[PDB]
Each structure stands twice: as C-alpha cells, then as structure tokens.
C-alpha cells in the first residue's frame, strides 16, 4: 500500500537516524585518547600554593 510504503520510508529514515554505533565509536575513541592508570603510589602528594 501507499501508506505502507510511506511507513517503510519513515522507518528507513528512523533507522538511519538511530544508529548508536557512532556513539559507541566516539566513546571508544575518547577512552583510547584518555588511556588512564593511577593509584600506584599511595599518597600522591598534590601540594599546591
């Protein structure tokens, strides 16, 4: 039906607009950019004026 074809087009647009793989890739890229590791020393003396 014409209404069904329009609904299929809207669903394709929604699937394009609702990926979340880009969000997952951005989160992974941010984590890789961070690359953290701490607590090896007990009293990390953050002495500042």
């Amino acid at each position: 039906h014409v209404e069904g074809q329009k609904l299929k087009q809207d669903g394709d647009s929604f699937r394009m607009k609702l990926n979340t793989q880009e969000i997952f890739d951005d989160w992974a890229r941010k984590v890789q950019q961070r690359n953290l590791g701490v607590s090896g020393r007990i009293f990390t003396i953050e002495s500042t004026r």
């Binding site: 020393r41 009293f43 003396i45 002495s47």
Partner: peptide, 28 residues
C-alpha cells in the same frame, strides 16, 4: 622527688608534617 621533667609531650607541627612529607615526596 624529681619534679616535673615528664619528657615535654609534644608532636611535629602540621606544617612540619607537610614539610617532611614534601621531603619524602622529593624522595618518592
């Protein structure tokens, strides 16, 4: 009778503790 002389109970200052800590941090 050995009046007083009870060792003068005292401790290092907080600034002194921080300074010894800074020396240890240099030594860390």
């Amino acid at each position: 009778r050995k009046l007083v002389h009870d060792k003068e109970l005292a401790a290092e200052d907080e600034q002194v503790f921080l300074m010894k800590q800074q020396s240890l941090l240099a030594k860390q």
